[PDB]
Design a protein around this ligand. Structure first.
Ligand code: S3P
Length: 424
């Protein structure tokens, strides 16, 4: 495979960018639409849906379970029943949301369903969710990929305790299907360190939009009452995490990037994102239903806690590497990134140091000292966000090439074209 040369920005970037839909919101809407249709509530359409490998894996997963998902662009319509064929096998790819959100849903069928995924996915955490399903009465063969969920057409539900420190998706996956368990579900996270609170809150918010009653009033505990899931139209927001890769271009070049269709109130962690950008003294403004970021003339090192928004780490690490020479930045709260698409703490360390940088993995993150970088081959590890981090670096370092820019298809297949149009 040919590398992809990351274009440089010898002058400030100036651009209006539209990023496609939120992967997290699209895949939740697909699951909730599937549940409504399976309950006999009718078809649902999701408008502005992201079309990417992770959402194609989710809609193919629902079709493996027997549902129908129509739509060739961003408007997807879900209908039908959960009625898997003999030998049903869900391909999870490297999509955590398919791996974690579809085994519960699948426990609703009366035909077992096998789950498999990419070689690289087999290294990602999953066993605590499979133990939770067994505790809820589900027969599950296997403790890792490939595993089989032997549903009985019913799932009893009840109360379960789970260690979800490795992934908030274990909580979201249980919550999304819980209203269809006979008795609902009370889920308790045991211990501490629960990452990605905004993504569990995203789940709760979308459940309430579907008419599901969920009590999240006590931290680390969720109670979902059994009840119908409405068949409604879903309107998907732009992916704000991917927007940050583009906004980073403004930040490191002293330029100006606007993102269209930015929601003033979002189901995503918009407020965390805008606060981090403001930490680097970017000016951030809302205007014309768009978000405009103007980068500073320079920025020093920063400390940032990414526990709630760990998927920002690759872009934020690239920002830290490009701070004024000698600056030190500490990224913390992100031990769980060892279990992501790749071990992102190790990979970011490896690729920054390859370019001559100074990045030290810590027990919960990275310490990065901004030092002059040089050309190299930035490896993506089949991880869309490693690939985009290489693009951010290459804005300010000539001769940086990403090995596999097609890794961006996980959540942003048009990234090369969008990035090229932005840098111009
Ligand atoms: O539920 C979701 O949509 C996601 C939750 C987070 O997972 P972790 O809590 O496993 O980091 C986030 O990192 C992932 O990219 C998307």
């Amino acid at each position: 495979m040919k590398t992809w040369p990351a274009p440089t920005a010898p002058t400030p970037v100036r651009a209006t960018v539209t990023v496609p839909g939120s992967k997290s919101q699209t895949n939740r809407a697909l699951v909730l639409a599937a549940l409504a249709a399976a309950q006999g509530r009718g078809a649902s359409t999701i408008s502005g849906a992201l079309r990417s490998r992770d959402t194609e894996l989710m809609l193919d997963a629902l079709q493996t379970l027997g549902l129908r998902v129509d739509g060739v662009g961003s408007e997807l319509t879900v209908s039908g029943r959960i009625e898997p064929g003999p030998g049903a096998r869900v391909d999870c790819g490297l999509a955590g949301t398919v791996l974690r959100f579809v085994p519960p849903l699948a426990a609703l069928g009366s035909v077992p369903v096998t789950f498999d995924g990419d070689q690289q996915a087999r290294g990602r955490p999953i066993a605590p969710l499979l133990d939770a399903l067994r505790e809820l009465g589900v027969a599950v063969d296997g403790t890792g990929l490939p595993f089989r969920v032997r549903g009985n057409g019913s799932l009893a539900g009840g109360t379960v305790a789970i260690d979800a420190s490795a992934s908030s998706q274990f909580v979201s996956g249980l919550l999304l299907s819980a209203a269809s368990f006979t008795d609902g579900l009370t889920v308790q996270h045991t211990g501490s360190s629960l990452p990605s609170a905004p993504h569990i809150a995203m789940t709760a918010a979308m459940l309430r939009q579907a008419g599901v009653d969920i009590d999240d009033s006590t931290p680390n505990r969720w109670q979902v009452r059994p009840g119908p899931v409405a068949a409604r139209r879903w309107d998907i927001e732009p992916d704000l995490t991917n927007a940050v890769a583009f906004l980073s271009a403004a930040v490191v070049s002293g330029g100006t990037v606007r993102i269209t269709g930015w929601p003033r109130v979002s189901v995503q962690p918009a407020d965390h994102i805008l606060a981090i950008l403001r930490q680097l003294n970017a000016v951030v403004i809302h205007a014309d239903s768009s978000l405009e970021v103007r980068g500073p003339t320079g920025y020093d090192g920063f400390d940032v806690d990414l526990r709630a928004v760990g998927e920002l780490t690759p872009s934020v690490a690239a920002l830290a590497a490009l701070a004024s020479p000698g600056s030190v930045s500490r990224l913390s709260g992100i031990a769980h990134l060892r279990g992501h698409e790749t071990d992102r703490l190790a990979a970011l360390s490896t690729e920054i140091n390859r370019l001559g940088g100074t990045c030290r993995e810590t027990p919960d993150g990275l310490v990065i000292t901004a030092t002059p970088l040089r050309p190299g081959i930035w490896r993506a590890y089949a991880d869309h966000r490693m690939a985009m981090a290489g693009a951010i670096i290459g804005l300010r370092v000539a001769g940086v090439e990403v090995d596999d820019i097609a890794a961006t298809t996980k959540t942003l297949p048009e990234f090369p074209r969008l990035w090229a149009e932005m840098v111009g």
